[PDB]
Amino acid sequence: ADVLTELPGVGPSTADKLIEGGYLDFMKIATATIGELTDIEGISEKAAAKMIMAARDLCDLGFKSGVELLKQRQSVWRLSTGSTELDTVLAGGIESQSVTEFAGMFGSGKTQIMHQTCVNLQMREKIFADLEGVVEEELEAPKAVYIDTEGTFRPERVVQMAEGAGIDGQTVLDNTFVARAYNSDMQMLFAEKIEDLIKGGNNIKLVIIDSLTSTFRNEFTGRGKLAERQQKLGRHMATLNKLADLYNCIVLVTNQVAAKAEQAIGGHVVGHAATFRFFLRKSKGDKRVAKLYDSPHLPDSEAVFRITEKGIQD
Numbered sequence: 001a002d003v004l005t006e007l008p009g010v011g012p013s014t015a016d017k018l019i020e021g022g023y024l025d026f027m028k029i030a031t032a033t034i035g036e037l038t039d040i041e042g043i044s045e046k047a048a049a050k051m052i053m054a055a056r057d058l059c060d061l062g063f064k065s066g067v068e069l070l071k072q073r074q075s076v077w078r079l080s081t082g083s084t085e086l087d088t089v090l091a092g093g094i095e096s097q098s099v100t101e102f103a104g105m106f107g108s109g110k111t112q113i114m115h116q117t118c119v120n121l122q123m124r125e126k127i128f129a130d131l132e133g134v135v136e137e138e139l140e141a142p143k144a145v146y147i148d149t150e151g152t153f154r155p156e157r158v159v160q161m162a163e164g165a166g167i168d169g170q171t172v173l174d175n176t177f178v179a180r181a182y183n184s185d186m187q188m189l190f191a192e193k194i195e196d197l198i199k200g201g202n203n204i205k206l207v208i209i210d211s212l213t214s215t216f217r218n219e220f221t222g223r224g225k226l227a228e229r230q231q232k233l234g235r236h237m238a239t240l241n242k243l244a245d246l247y248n249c250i251v252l253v254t255n256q257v258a259a260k261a262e263q264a265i266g267g268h269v270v271g272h273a274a275t276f277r278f279f280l281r282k283s284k285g286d287k288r289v290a291k292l293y294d295s296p297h298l299p300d301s302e303a304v305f306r307i308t309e310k311g312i313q314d
């Protein structure tokens with residue numbers, strides 16, 4: 001909560017050193033380790049350890065039970081996918097504080113969904129939040145981040161889907177950041193730099209990685225370099241899950257498939273990391289099917305939807 005000086009033991013001198021290391025939120029310090037804090041100029045161990053304990057205390061991070069357990073869950077807001085059936089399968093829409101994955105063959109609509117959500121983000125009617133655990137000024141001026149990994153982002157389609165929704169296409173584009181990553185290093189660094197955007201006053205509420213694994217699969221082809229691949233992707237996933245919790249934003253990723261009828265690539269690292277997993281498949285014409293096959297509290301379910309000039313519908 002921006003004012004670091006409210007932290008016991010942290011005065012203006014100390015507060016200065018911190019804002020530098022990217023630390024400028026109470027949660028960020030409460031979830032830090034002594035090591036990553038002492039890496040800053042003159043921040044000792046006892047100080048780093050003490051402020052970490054104070055931050056946790058401040059953000060009240062302890063044992064919770066009963067009604068408090070339900071309150072915590074009220075901070076999760078959801079974004080509509082444009083499909084009534086898909087929204088009902090997600091039990092509302094896409095959840096914040098989680099990583100949800102859309103895997104599927106070519107043309108199954110993975111990228112279309114990514115584009116639609118950028119548009120939907122700019123429509124308060126598309127956002128479903130509990131007033132009890134989410135203040136409106138927290139949803140104010142929401143922005144999306146699209147990490148394009150294959151070069152498929154299309155300003156045109158966002159605009160078209162915007163018209164189809166009834167918003168201004170330019171509006172959506174002005175509130176959507178797009179970073180073209182040519183490799184896993186750029187992909188991972190862009191994800192870690194999302195903090196600097198929030199630091200610059202941007203309210204990042206939607207983070208998209210399309211595609212989540214194409215770079216890794218192409219950079220570590222040899223299978224005697226699989227442990228290598230999984231390790232780097234594991235750090236990426238952790239970075240993604242953390243920023244989803246910390247900034248109460250939704251992280252959305254797409255995944256390709258491979259035979260072995262098919263399964264999303266990325267191995268275990270992606271399996272455990274993604275909270276909601278979907279398989280997208282084609283049907284007749286513009287019809288598509290979204291199969292939820294993994295989640296912590298929802299049963300497997302299918303949703304039929306369409307891809308049209310308007311975008312995602314039905």
Ligand SMILES: Nc1ncnc2c1ncn2[C@@H]1O[C@H](COP(=O)(O)OP(=O)(O)NP(=O)(O)O)[C@@H](O)[C@H]1O
Nearest residue numbers: 104105106107108109110111112113160307308309
């Ligand atoms: N402007 C449009 N109007 C109607 N349909 C469209 C439009 N743009 C794209 N589509 C449809 O979207 C389908 C492909 O969607 P897309 O999201 O790119 O697939 P994908 O899952 O990302 N596959 P891949 O690129 O291999 O990863 C097409 O084959 C078109 O029928």
Ligand SMILES: [K+]
Nearest residue numbers: 105106107108
């Ligand atoms: K394609």
Ligand SMILES: [K+]
Nearest residue numbers: 106111150152
């Ligand atoms: K593609």
Ligand SMILES: [Mg+2]
Nearest residue numbers: 097098244245
């Ligand atoms: Mg989470």
Ligand SMILES: [Mg+2]
Nearest residue numbers: 110111152254
């Ligand atoms: Mg695609």
